Design a protein around this ligand. Structure first.
Ligand SMILES: Clc1cccc(CN2CCOCC2)c1
Ligand SMILES: Clc1cccc(CN2CCOCC2)c1
Lengths: 304, 304
């Protein structure tokens, strides 16, 4: 019993983190097989960062300008290319600690763990969601660029995020491991405003199920609603619309608890309309939206 | 920028987790050098667990009754002893993945990471505090016993906790790695009530500093207070007393932010007296008490 914001064990990803230096800029790289992946802005002087031309800047760089250090041993760079907003440094040594892995592009509302790193060294691990506005609410200081987000399925690391930017509003933007930004962000020091940070409705419902399973039930009410009626309330409170796909995904939690999805929607509706009246749910005074239905099933069933 | 409930990277501890089976009971063990540490109740049939005599039960056990599996390879047990509430299984192989490590007994209010494990396999990592009543608010299902709590200082794992018990109230109890319980709990299926779960005042103040550093300042007020006056308010709200030791420990955060500790105490006092009036601090609607002053400095400075 008990429910915690839980990250994947980070060991498999720790063994992939390296330090990348170009000129005077140091950040983190991901060493998988004989390739190191890092943000392309490693080639920038923060001066460049106002309106950088990455193709033109990269002309002036050679394999031997990219200094790649795995612990305290230097990797020999034998090739470099740009793919979107990441650099791929071909090294002469396959990472012996390469786990089975995939690159995935996640959708907003999906959750992942971040291994926050500085100078190729892990500092900590926490669990995030891709916000509906394609930002993440991370903890990232200077030098944390190239820190990665991931999911683990048994022995297989799915890399979904690499850290690039902090917005002037202190929220974070980054790429998939093909270097394509989540959302409309560019790797440029410019005016970039995030859109509306809406609540991930299906995750809140999942977390209300998790609450019932763990004994927190005060918010269960006598009411039900419809998808359309619920979705009117959701829109008023900047909650994402709930789809039939979201209802289907919540089925197992529905099945386990014997509380129909639309009944739980009517409980959430009352919580939106009435607030918590100073009460708490799984030790939170707000509606948590960074657990997926899959996360609740996983944590509640004990999957390793 | 941004502030997250961050755990230590778990790799160093992942490589110490093994499966321990005695008769029909499987739980987790910690393999350090040529010793595996596990909860002694591994020798119990849940029948035993009502009033077990561990000395008498252990008479009936031999080295070859303790089945120790590290991944999918069996460890040869060449000795066993009981120290308090843990078993130490001497194996014939030193764990090649043994990190530099210490065993520490933490005090209430101190924080650590838990690697939740099932059948010797890591499932996830989260950050905890030892509650003032010597419980922890974990996420632990059957099979999670022998999961450990730890801190990392550069390359050195300090093990502070091993999981043993869930109380009928769904809070968790365990031992240091010498097998001594935190608090008055015994490894017996009996009536064990936790004491008052008070708030760790010094941690809330640390987290209010973390909030100011990250831009959340609405709660800063025009007031100051005294230690004695603050402590009257703390007692009314089941907050732990604030000592001069706590004030001294908050010094660096005081220094960085230029907000005197007693000024921040007067801000906390108003938050206790008036509540959040529907506002949030670092994305929480309650006062977070599972960051130490050390945790705020670490996360805010980027220590690896
Ligand atoms: Cl993370 C990711 C996101 C989108 C597509 C893909 C697959 N690739 C395969 C190679 O060429 C291009 C597409 C991966
Ligand atoms: Cl975790 C821990 C808690 C309390 C004391 C100690 C030190 N030991 C050294 C060996 O003998 C007994 C005491 C360790």
């Amino acid at each position: 019993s008990g429910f915690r914001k839980m990250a994947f064990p980070s060991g498999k990803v720790e063994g992939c983190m390296v330090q990348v230096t170009c000129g005077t800029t140091t950040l983190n790289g991901l060493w998988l097989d004989d390739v190191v992946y890092c943000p392309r802005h490693v080639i920038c002087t923060s001066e460049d960062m106002l309106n950088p031309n990455y193709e033109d800047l990269l002309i002036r760089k050679s394999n031997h300008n990219f200094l790649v250090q795995a612990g305290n041993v230097q990797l020999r760079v034998i090739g470099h290319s740009m793919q979107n907003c990441v650099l791929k440094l071909k090294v002469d040594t396959a990472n012996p600690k390469t786990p089975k892995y995939k690159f995935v592009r996640i959708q907003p509302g999906q959750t992942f763990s971040v291994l926050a790193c500085y100078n190729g060294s892990p500092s900590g691990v926490y669990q995030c969601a891709m916000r509906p506005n394609f930002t993440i609410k991370g903890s990232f200081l200077n030098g944390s660029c190239g820190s990665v987000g991931f999911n683990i399925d048994y022995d297989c690391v799915s890399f979904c995020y690499m850290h690039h930017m902090e917005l002037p509003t202190g929220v974070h933007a980054g790429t998939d491991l093909e270097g394509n930004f989540y959302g409309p962000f560019v790797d440029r020091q410019t005016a970039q405003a995030a859109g509306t940070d809406t609540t991930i409705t299906v995750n809140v419902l999942a977390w209300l199920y998790a609450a019932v399973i763990n004994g927190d039930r005060w918010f269960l009410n006598r009411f039900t609603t419809t998808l359309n009626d619920f979705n009117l309330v959701a829109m008023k409170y900047n909650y994402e619309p709930l789809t039939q796909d979201h209802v289907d995904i919540l089925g197992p939690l529905s099945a386990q608890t014997g509380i129909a999805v639309l009944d739980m929607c009517a409980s959430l509706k009352e919580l939106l309309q009435n607030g918590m009246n100073g009460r708490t749910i799984l030790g939170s005074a707000l509606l948590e939206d960074e657990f997926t239905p899959f996360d609740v099933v996983r944590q509640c069933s004990g999957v390793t």
